[PDB]
Curated annotation (Swiss-Prot):
Outcome when changing G204S: In CIPA; processed as wild-type but shows significantly diminished autophosphorylation in both neuronal and non-neuronal cells
Organism: Homo sapiens
Disease per record: Congenital insensitivity to pain with anhidrosis: Characterized by a congenital insensitivity to pain, anhidrosis (absence of sweating), absence of reaction to noxious stimuli, self-mutilating behavior, and intellectual disability. This rare autosomal recessive disorder is also known as congenital sensory neuropathy with anhidrosis or hereditary sensory and autonomic neuropathy type IV or familial dysautonomia type II.
Outcome after substituting R144W: In CIPA; processed as wild-type but shows significantly diminished autophosphorylation in both neuronal and non-neuronal cells
Post-translational modification: Ligand-mediated autophosphorylation. Interaction with SQSTM1 is phosphotyrosine-dependent. N-glycosylated. Isoform TrkA-I and isoform TrkA-II are N-glycosylated.
Effect of R270P: In CIPA; loss of function
UniProt protein name: High affinity nerve growth factor receptor
Gene this protein is translated from: NTRK1
Domain comment, as recorded: The transmembrane domain mediates interaction with KIDINS220.
Length: 280
């Protein structure tokens, strides 16, 4: 039984506090991965135990400053658990909306101002997501559902790529098997091909999400309508909050031919530079 050693955690050391969302994520304390400690815990046939073990091995290998930190599993008894660091500001899409000009409530937090994010800040969020993507492309890992709903925000506005998904985001998938069509490129919709270049397209849509403070791409349109748009070559419009240099980077992610799309490495480098010195 060769493979990656996955860290195991005794059940007695996991104390579940409350559900945060629905796989079915709870907030918990864990002693002692250090003192005692807050963590996020995902709860779940032998075929499932197979995917569990498999995904666990994979999660163990993919470790990077912008990938949500994975601590191990608990498999003594049922249900099976995956243990992750806790990202106190939840998912990026919800975070964005709560700092949008549209938000109905004020979003306290000692570590960020309520109200619209600074441009410097939006840029930092995008840079961080890209860095996550650079790492994954490096490993030839293809993420088939890149979107702010699958990113996590932690203390100090650290952003990491996570996982799905929350039932509140069902509207973001189209039932064919559920596809995130609004984030998919023509070659995915047309030919069912998914590549690192497909992820670069998705990331472009993530950029649009960030600079609209979390709006659904093509929110005015039905699923088939959005598919017509994507395949017929229509592009999402520049967000009001989005500077030309960034819209340019977006457009580059959206080349109809995958090979003309800029590399994720390139994309990240530009965003990081914009970020270190935000244009007016
Ligand atoms: N695999 C996996 C995995 C990894 C980490 C986490 C995690 C760590 N800190 C938090 C805080 C809130 C939270 N949420 C917010 C909404 O309730 C569901 C859950 C979630 C589920 C699906 C996708 C999300 F980006 C976030 N998740 N989370 C959750 C799942």
């Amino acid at each position: 039984g060769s493979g990656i050693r996955v860290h195991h955690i005794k059940r007695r050391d996991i104390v579940l506090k409350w559900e945060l969302g629905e796989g079915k994520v709870f907030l918990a304390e864990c002693h002692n991965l250090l003192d005692k400690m807050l963590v996020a815990v995902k709860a779940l046939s032998e075929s499932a135990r197979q995917d569990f073990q498999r995904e666990a091995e994979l999660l163990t290998m993919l470790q990077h400053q912008h990938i949500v930190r994975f601590f191990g599993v608990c498999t003594e008894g049922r249900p099976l658990l995956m243990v992750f660091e806790y990202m106190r500001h939840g998912d990026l899409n919800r975070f964005l909306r709560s700092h949008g000009p549209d938000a109905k409530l004020l979003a306290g937090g000692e570590d960020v101002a309520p109200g619209p994010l600074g441009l410097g800040q939006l840029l930092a969020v995008a840079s961080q997501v890209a860095a996550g993507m650079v790492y994954l492309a490096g490993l030839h890992f293809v993420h088939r559902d890149l979107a702010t709903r699958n990113c996590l925000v932690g203390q100090g506005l650290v952003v990491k790529i996570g996982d799905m998904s929350r039932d509140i985001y069902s509207t973001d998938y189209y039932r064919v098997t559920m596809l995130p069509i609004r984030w998919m490129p023509p070659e995915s919709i047309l030919y069912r091909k998914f590549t690192t270049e497909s992820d670069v397209w998705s990331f472009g849509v993530v950029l649009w999400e960030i600079f609209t403070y979390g709006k659904q791409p093509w929110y005015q349109l039905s699923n088939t309508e959005a598919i017509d748009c994507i395949t017929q070559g229509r592009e999402l419009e520049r967000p009001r909050a989005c500077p030309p240099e960034v819209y340019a980077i977006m457009r580059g992610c959206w080349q109809r031919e995958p090979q003309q799309r800029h590399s994720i490495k390139d994309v990240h480098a530009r965003l990081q530079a914009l970020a270190q010195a935000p244009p007016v």
